[PDB]
Amino acid sequence: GSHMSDRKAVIKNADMSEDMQQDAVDCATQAMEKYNIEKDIAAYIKKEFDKKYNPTWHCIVGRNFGSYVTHETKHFIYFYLGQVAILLFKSG
Amino acid sequence: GSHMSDRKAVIKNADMSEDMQQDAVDCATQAMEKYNIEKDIAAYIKKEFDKKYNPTWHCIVGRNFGSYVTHETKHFIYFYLGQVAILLFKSG
């Protein structure tokens, strides 16, 4: 509820407007304030993005993973919040 | 080139035909025979599935992550090969 209010956002790779990037960081911050487990954090972010920015989003949250994904233009972000990586993108 | 020929496949969650599940395991096995890094393993699997089973697939490979994703019916698998988890699904 406040333990994330000091975490550092580092954008690693984005194809996304600055405003939507900010919203992704804000959403992930909110998720991590509420939830401890990666799957629940990912669920919160995905559902919020489906509401704010239309379906269909997909979210991966974790400390060790690689990915290869396809996304709609201007709808991709990969970033860290503290030591946790978040992949968030729209496809479908 | 042979160091994966003794690894155990454990299906955790699937919405997929038995034959396609077998192909996913086989594909991941081939990928891991060739590539050491999770991102390259994921890329190999995604590209093969796009070819064999049509676009658009997405693949996550790693030891620590959670996810929340949406997929087309009958086109989802989440499994381990040895100690590495593989998420593979079709959306778009």
Binding site: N13, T70, L87, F89 | I37, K39, A42, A43
Partner: peptide, 12 residues
Amino acid sequence: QPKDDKNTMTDS
């Protein structure tokens, strides 16, 4: 690599 594909890897 296609423009709308992406490949990610976590740091060590």
